[PDB]
Amino acid sequence: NLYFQHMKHGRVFIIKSYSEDDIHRSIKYNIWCSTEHGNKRLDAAYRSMNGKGPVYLLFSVNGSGHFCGVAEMKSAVDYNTCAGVWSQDKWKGRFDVRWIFVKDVPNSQLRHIRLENNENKPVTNSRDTQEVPLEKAKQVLKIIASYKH
Numbered sequence: 175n176l177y178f179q180h181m182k183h184g185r186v187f188i189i190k191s192y193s194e195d196d197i198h199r200s201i202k203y204n205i206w207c208s209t210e211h212g213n214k215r216l217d218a219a220y221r222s223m224n225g226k227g228p229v230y231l232l233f234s235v236n237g238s239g240h241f242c243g244v245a246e247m248k249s250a251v252d253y254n255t256c257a258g259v260w261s262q263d264k265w266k267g268r269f270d271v272r273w274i275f276v277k278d279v280p281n282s283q284l285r286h287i288r289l290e291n292n293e294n295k296p297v298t299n300s301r302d303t304q305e306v307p308l309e310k311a312k313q314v315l316k317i318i319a320s321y322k323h
């Protein structure tokens with residue numbers, strides 16, 4: 175029921191991937207990369223935190239109809255790394271993550287949570303690197319952590 179009850183200064187972003195393979199690689203090696211604008215957005219959030227709070231990432235594969243897990247950003251963005259490590263060469267850079275939950279949670283469990291910073295659109299209709307208001311993110315994080323088959 176009650177996970178994440180102690181996250182006073184957290185910042186939470188949506189990750190939308192076109193590649194489940196990339197997600198599987200992210201889970202295996204605890205690393206991720208985003209778009210150029212996505213990297214810079216996540217980089218600013220992580221570094222402006224200065225270890226004072228967690229940066230959580232809510233992962234969902236595009237078109238899957240569910241979210242697939244939760245990870246915490248554990249590193250700043252390194253923009254000069256080996257290329258071609260992901261599904262496409264389009265992804266440049268790298269940062270560490272620590273996956274906390276790896277589980278499929280249907281969008282029905284989350285669609286009624288709406289983001290006041292995204293024209294009050296449901297959280298399940300967000301784009302890649304959309305930031306979630308912390309009070310709405312606590313709801314999503316709790317539902318994911320406590321969802322069971």
Ligand SMILES: C[n+]1cnc2[nH]cnc2c1N
Pocket residue numbers: 190191192193196207208209260261265302
């Ligand atoms: C690796 N990776 C990172 N960010 C994304 N956004 C959409 N697809 C991706 C992907 N495959």
